[PDB]
Design a protein around this ligand. Structure first.
Ligand code: 8SZ
Ligand code: 8SZ
Ligand code: 8SZ
Ligand code: 8SZ
Ligand code: ZN
Ligand code: ZN
Ligand code: ZN
Ligand code: ZN
Lengths: 206, 206, 206, 206
């Protein structure tokens, strides 16, 4: 069967509640990788995301490339983010989504620490390219983003990269949600017990 | 709708003519990001690149991370470079390719200065890793470099990072051209009028 | 009669146990040259290497070129490393593998002292270059590293240089083990009584 | 048809005349790559080799790995050696044979200088392994060396690596001369107008 994993990064943000409504209204479950600072200021949205059956994973504290990878703080930031999230939803998530992807940032050393810290790493198989259409008219932008993901949806499993801190991104989702549904896809959240590898390194320990 | 953008960096140099010839035989256009000192040493090579339908953009004067980013010479160096190139081909190009990529060197300040200067910044979506294959037979280095490229071309647009200043890179170009062409790609040069953002910062102003 | 001597340097490490299993699974014997710091921290892995029919040789304490060769600490470091290994496996190995190879580091003075100390020296006849392949997907890297080795196996004896301290390296070994066996090689460990010279200096006293 | 290019390195030496006799009486042509100091001390042998129709190439001045490749003195030494030989045989030879082979020593920069200085570079396709049997009974040693090349001779063109500064090598030559002669090989010397590439880098400019 075809399963589609919508993933949303850099949240929560001010369009997240509209997204959570749009998703719920189509009974569609998704995954959110949250930044620590946005977890601090939107505890409600965090609690709601988990409450409406979506997976709530980490996307670090600083979203800073040099700190995470060059200064080796990745796993440390993923753990601190994990704590903040656990304080709200009462579970300690294991799935991380690397800021800027894992390639080339997540070197062999840091990949051991992730494995040793108990974390998984997910990248994506489709880039919605939503960041291109920023600060542009929302509906035109969103329609293009929609077509971006739909025409690249070909494989039995797909992990789609989006950003709910962008209006054109959240606006893109309704057209994506059932356009993908007719191609036979279903919209699941990530489940830890059903982990399968999706990382640029093809590193199957994560 | 598929378009491959071969880009070659740190040229011109002693293999560039052989590469320019390979490009010509295949009627393939591409893009060159030049270092200022090589602009001055091989001024006729520059002419010919632009004369055969390739884009000529800048890749700095010093290629020195500390000077470019920590000290913020970037926009200066790309301007100086631009001037040299203009004096030879007439055009003042706008596109720049950052040494060592934009991430994390081009901070928001420099990025502001870039867009303020009218300049533009390209990174890449495929890294051929061509320059690292320098301690094996050239023909075998070229085959692994071609394979790297051919097996990552998937998106409707691909910006392929290469260097025309290593023999194994230029030797890879024939295999790469034939392979991608099998995959339905066209080999156009960058066009100024037809710009779309391609950078690690996801900053669509540049 | 064709024999392939897989040698693994700078271990033991965190992929070593998995390497030991893959070896064991193909009924294959190999050689390990160990650094002093890792013999101390992975003593079990050392005993297992020996216990499972592999040769356990030295690869110094510091892996530092200036201390080993410029300051002449080579024989000292190999002796200290020898002591550490013997406290674990109960025999004092004589074969050493020079960090960075013997050329040009092991000058005649040090080569004389090596000879006067009872030590043997092995360089290699095939460089897998496996450690250089740390910036691509691990399976892709392993396949190219396999290719490197398979295409250079031409002589009845081949001493292949690898590193069991990198993920892409241990992943390459299955394809190497299957290609070379198909090319007719057998995978033996170094035996001290059967010593034959393999060094860049063509010095057959080592 | 089959042609065998016997090449002898590091000479001339004290068995060179005995080899030149062994060659002449078997109506056999060869190639000698000479060290500058041995050219200085054996002008007769140098003159004789050319006078008797063999090719006389360079093998550098110091035979020092670090000087040649790391300090980039390779081409300088081949030119200084070229001068010495030209003063004897009245022509300036173009073919050089890299001490310790060209891999990895002859990097891309140096391969350009060799190309720009007008030099060619030959490695070999067969290593006689003659250095292993040094200071050993000449008779046994020579027989093994003879077969070493014989068991590795399969291709229409073969460049055998030998050393006429060793007794066991020169003694091996008679037996080699008859194994190859039976396989249909002919023993021609290298001649410059018929140059074809034989180098570990597969750099076909050399
Ligand atoms: N607005 C996008 C900035 C960062 C994009 C990058 N792909 C990432 O870290 N997504 O979570
Ligand atoms: N190993 C240093 C990186 C150099 C390559 C870099 N990607 C670049 O600027 N190419 O043009
Ligand atoms: N310059 C890289 C050093 C690694 C290769 C070297 N031959 C070695 O020490 N192996 O153990
Ligand atoms: N007696 C062997 C010393 C040098 C061997 C090496 N293969 C070489 O440079 N031959 O010319
Ligand atoms: Zn992000
Ligand atoms: Zn560059
Ligand atoms: Zn080592
Ligand atoms: Zn030599």
């Amino acid at each position: 069967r075809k399963v589609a994993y919508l993933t949303f990064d850099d949240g929560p943000g001010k369009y997240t509640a509209e997204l959570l409504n749009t998703l719920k209204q189509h009974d569609a479950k998704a995954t959110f990788f949250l930044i620590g600072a946005n977890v601090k200021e939107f505890p409600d949205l965090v609690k709601r995301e988990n409450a409406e059956g979506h997976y709530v994973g980490m996307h670090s504290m600083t979203h800073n490339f040099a700190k995470l990878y060059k200064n080796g703080e990745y796993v440390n930031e993923m753990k601190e983010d994990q704590g903040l999230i656990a304080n709200i939803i009462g579970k300690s998530p294991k799935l991380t989504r690397p800021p800027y992807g894992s390639m080339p940032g997540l070197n062999e050393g840091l990949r051991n620490k992730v494995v040793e810290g108990g974390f998984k790493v997910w990248d994506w198989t489709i880039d919605s390219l939503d960041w291109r259409y920023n600060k542009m008219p929302v509906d035109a932008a969103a329609a293009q983003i929609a077509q971006n993901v739909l025409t690249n949806a070909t494989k039995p499993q797909e992990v789609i990269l989006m950003h709910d801190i962008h209006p054109q991104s959240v606006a893109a989702v309704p057209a994506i949600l059932k356009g993908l549904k007719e191609k036979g896809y279903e919209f699941e959240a990530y489940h830890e017990e059903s982990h399968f590898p999706v990382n640029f390194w093809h590193d199957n320990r994560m």
